[model samples]
Target: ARIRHVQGDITEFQGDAIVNAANNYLKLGAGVAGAILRKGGPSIQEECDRIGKIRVGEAAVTGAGNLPVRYVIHAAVLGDEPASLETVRKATKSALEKAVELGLKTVAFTGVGAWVGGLPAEAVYRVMLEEIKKAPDTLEVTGVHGTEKSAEAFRRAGLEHHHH
Candidate 1:
């Protein structure tokens, strides 16, 4: 599998699943979560409410409701506990692991721990790209965002691993 850096709203991604930068309780707040909750509709929130609290760095799966993707992988990057670099890496790894286990061929990801989670885009990209590289060949991942600014940032750091 290979990783692609994409600069756009992951909510619009037509893939097996899209990753959300969620809090531990799985509330669909602003940032990536807001876009998902809005476009994916209320079923996503209802499912999260049923799933209850998940620890930071942990991932949970639910039907995507009206979203284009088959599922939404909620990567709990914050809440209950503050997000850190380690949790960001853990979340990314866990999400990919879930995707592989679920037989998903492609997934798109956000810059976990960035934005409201409080990490720089560069830092998030560095850890995320590294973990994405370790994914088994069974899965393909896209690093995504809404802005061209961070998209370039992700690609630059992605190339850092590309050379490795």
Candidate 2:
């Protein structure tokens, strides 16, 4: 029942679920999704492909494959266009919903729509925190894959952050 910030590769995060910054297509091509694909192995991508297209602002769940987590929540935060604050909010909400549905008590998140999704770090920090706070109080949420810039933004926002 805590919200913690962790700076490092999200692939290494140990939780009941880890969120992927995925496109609606569910392709693990680049950004956080790519890292997850690389670490979790090709099976993760194949499962995602099997699940087919996920709508933007929606979420899809798959086995973690070789990753340390149990499930991977593919948060469809972007499509053909750049990510918006609404994108982050919706993706975060959907991922949390999936976690709740799966009866997961611990979930780790990456910056849902930042980096390749083209959202600003500060905006991501604010939007992510806002939506994440709405998760069930029984859930333990950790924000992973933070950079120094994002951590600074979190600090300015009076949010506590940690580093690997």
Candidate 3:
């Protein structure tokens, strides 16, 4: 049940799963989804489309394609507008639950709503922390992938991991 804040690209992370900071439409537009699409290939987006639109706070899964992970969890943290704190909270909880259901021990999370959606990194960390605290110990949120500034936000908020 280790929580580590990692400063890197989510696509490069080798774990059970990597979470995509996705919208309800699940299209691989700019931000985390675009990076993942470029690396993982179009199959990921194809699978996501097949899964169709999900509500905010829900998640859909797909094969990781060429990415160095077992699965991709598309966590819909926003929809038609900027992500609210409530949406972030639900997305975190749903993503964790999906990972557990798939028997994934380790997962990497992109900074959900902290970039294009304009949500504060600190708020994202807080919502993630709240849901993560309620998660089962067997499920480990291994790393949070973001820029230095976002990583620093986690550290300043006292939510960053001390060890892997």
Best by TM-score: 1
Where in model 3 is the C-alpha error above 4 Å?
Answer: 80-82, 112-116, 159-164
Give each model a TM-score. 0.90, 0.86, 0.87
Q: Write the per-residue lDDT of candidate 3 for residues 1-164, one digit (tens) a residue.
A: 55778877788898889887788888878766777898999899889889998998888889999999999988887876658888888887888889989999888876644323676667667777778778888877855656678776666765445877
lDDT: worst 10-residue window of model 1: 112-121
What TM-score would candidate 3 get against the native? 0.87
- Please give the CA lDDT of all the candidate structures: 0.81, 0.78, 0.78
**How do the candidates rank by lDDT, highest first?**
1, 3, 2
How many clashes does each candidate structure show, in the order listed?
0, 0, 0
Q: Once superposed on the true structure, which residue ranges of model 1 sit more than 4 Å away at CA?
A: 112-116, 161-164
Clash list (residue pairs), candidate 1? none
For model 3, give the RMSD to the true fold. Answer: 3.8
* Superposed Cα deviation of residue 4, candidate 3 (Å): 0.9
90-125: candidate 1 lDDT, tens digit per residue: 988888888988899989887643333567667777
RMSD of each: 2.4, 4.5, 3.8
